[PDB]
Amino acid sequence: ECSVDIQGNDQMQFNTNAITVDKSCKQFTVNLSHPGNLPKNVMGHNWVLSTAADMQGVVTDGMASGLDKDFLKPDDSRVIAHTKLIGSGEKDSVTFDVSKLKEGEQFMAFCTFPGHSALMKGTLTLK
Ligand SMILES: [Cu+2]
């Protein structure tokens, strides 16, 4: 129980707004998929993890980075883990070390495609 399957869809939502990572896990894996019909340049989604304090800067700088950079500032030290940006019918996975998390803190998981984090934002918590 050290992975989660996340979908981002044409309605600009992930399937979850709260991810729990079992603290017995040494690594955690997010398997993102896009069950919609819309292409990456219209309704692209990524899955990006940061602290709550860093989310807004990652989102804003991501928009400024452009589609060709997956709407994610390259080499952003604030990004704990992230997938690539995907469109309809694609999938992407990322694994990260659970040592990057700590109990008692709600981390933020979000998409940086412009506008999406109005809905595509939620918490991740080690329990
Ligand atoms: Cu998105």
* CA neighbours closer than 13 Å in the CB half-sphere of residue 52: 8
Calculate how far, in angstroms, residue 121's C-alpha sits from the geometric centre of ligand 1. 10
Q: Domain range for residue 91?
A: 3-126
Number of structural domains found in the chain: 1
The alpha carbon of residue 75 and the mean position of all alpha carbons in its chain are separated, in whole angstroms, by 16
In 3D, which of 125, 121, 127 has the Cα closest to residue 47? 121
- Pairing of β 107-110 and β 121-126: antiparallel
DSSP one-letter code for 2: -
Q: Resolution in Å, one decimal, please.
A: 1.2
**What spacing in Å lies between the alpha carbon of 108 and ligand 1's midpoint?**
14
User: Length of the chain, please?
Assistant: 127
C-alpha span between 78 and 110 (Å, rounded)? 13
Q: Is position 34 annotated in a ligand binding site? A: no
Which CATH number characterizes residue 44's domain?
2.60.40.420
Q: How far is the CA of 71 from the centre of ligand 1 (A)?
A: 10
116 is in an annotated binding site: yes
The tokens describing 44, both together, are: 């692209």
63 labeled part of a ligand binding site: no
Give the C-alpha separation, 50 to 58, whole Å: 8
Q: How was this structure determined?
A: X-ray
CB-neighbour burial class of residue 123 (10 A; exposed 0-12, middle 13-18, buried 19+): middle
User: Ligand 1 center to residue 126 CA distance, Å?
Assistant: 24
| Amino acid at residue number 100 | K
Instruction: Give the H or E element holding residue 29.
Output: strand 27-33
2 is in an annotated binding site: no
Q: How far is it, in rounded angstroms, from Cα 32 to Cα 27? A: 16
Distance from Cα 17 to the centre of ligand 1, integer Å: 13
